[PDB]
């Protein structure tokens, strides 16, 4: 029960759902005895961070630039990305309140850490499988369609109210 | 005459470490020269979106999309194949739906794969889950743009509304 040392990113390797993904190997050390490795995608970092912006607005963390879906297999960058993520982890456990944070603990498996020979199992049980992502996406697009429709309705009604207000203002403008 | 009723031959469970169901569709033109097209539930749905796009007037059936419950079941698969079969009957039975760009690009009327080309044509026409998700996120972005613009206008209108109502309050006395 104290300061977690800066989790180390060893490197990354490209793995598969037979969609090719880049995954990062993060070694995290509890005590000089207990230590383990977790696999995280850039995306998992992004999600954790979004939850962090949500939970602690007061302190906000940097992350290297998103791919923007257009993929780069490239000099620097990927190295630069890893440096950035490493910085992210350092600052993330350096902040007294965001470190013992729950989502973070879930992220680094501080509570129920994976064993030496597992890491993959843990992996697959943390990141979103393609179907789940697809589902999530369809939810988001639909919800946006209904909501945006509701917004348009409110727009019409509020503008007509503006016409009413304007004319009554003319009426008590003369009298 | 012109290509009649594509009947679906069957299905096979495929993978890229996410499991596909693909449907083997038999497509004929004249008494001879028969060929095969490979399509998944995804593409059928896409085509259906295109028809609901250009031609609102008639809407076509498709078996229930199912998510979490087991994607591969006796009844579920059977109905899927049956319904899709129906979709096809309707798809070629109608005038202009037999000849339309998306429809011919779909059923490979012009350059149909006869030989092993079929497996090839698969990977060439269809959106795989990566591609599907990619596109879906692109769309989601654009929508968030549109809603950014709308919330901006609603904010303007509401600001004006409070301005007018305060003026009415001041001109009340």
Curated annotation (Swiss-Prot), chain B:
Binding-site residues for a 1,2-diacyl-sn-glycero-3-phospho-(1D-myo-inositol-3-phosphate), renumbered to this chain: 40, 42, 80
Subunit structure: Homooligomer. Interacts with EGFR.
BP GO annotations: early endosome to late endosome transport; endosome to lysosome transport; protein targeting to lysosome; receptor recycling
Domain notes: The PX domain mediates interaction with membranes enriched in phosphatidylinositol 3-phosphate.
Topological relation to the membrane, as annotated: Peripheral membrane protein
Portion of the parent chain present: 105 to 277 of 344
UniProt family annotation: Belongs to the sorting nexin family.
Gene Ontology, cellular component aspect: early endosome; early endosome membrane; endosome membrane; intracellular membrane-bounded organelle; late endosome; late endosome membrane; lysosome
PX domain mapped to chain residues: 1-114
Name assigned to this protein: Sorting nexin-16
MF term (GO), any: phosphatidylinositol binding
Function summary: May be involved in several stages of intracellular trafficking. Plays a role in protein transport from early to late endosomes. Plays a role in protein transport to the lysosome. Promotes degradation of EGFR after EGF signaling. Plays a role in intracellular transport of vesicular stomatitis virus nucleocapsids from the endosome to the cytoplasm.
Cell compartment(s), UniProt: Early endosome membrane; Late endosome membrane; Cytoplasm; Lysosome
Organ and tissue specificity: Detected in placenta, lung, liver,heart and pancreas.
Keywords for the protein's UniProt record, in alphabetical order: Coiled coil, Cytoplasm, Endosome, Lipid-binding, Lysosome, Membrane, Phosphoprotein, Protein transport, Transport
Modification sites for Phosphoserine: 118
Residue ranges of coiled coil: 119-173
């Amino acid at each position: 029960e104290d300061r977690p040392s800066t989790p180390t990113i060893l490197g990354y390797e490209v793995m598969e759902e037979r969609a090719k993904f880049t995954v990062y190997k993060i070694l995290v050390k509890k005590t000089p005895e207990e230590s383990w490795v977790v696999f995280r995608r850039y995306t998992d970092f992004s999600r954790l961070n979004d939850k962090l912006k949500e939970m602690f607005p007061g302190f906000r963390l940097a992350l290297p630039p998103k791919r923007w879906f257009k993929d780069n297999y490239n000099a620097d960058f990927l190295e630069d990305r890893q440096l950035g993520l490493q910085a992210f982890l350092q600052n993330l456990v350096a902040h007294k309140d965001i470190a013992n944070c729950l989502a973070v603990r879930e992220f680094l498996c501080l509570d129920d850490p994976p064993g030496p020979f597992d890491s993959l199992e843990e992996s697959r049980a943390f990141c979103e499988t393609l179907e789940e992502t697809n589902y999530r996406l369809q939810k988001e697009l639909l919800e946006k369609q209904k909501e945006m429709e509701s917004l348009k309705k409110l727009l019409s009604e509020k503008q007509l109210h503006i016409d009413t207000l304007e004319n009554r203002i003319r009426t008590l403008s003369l009298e």
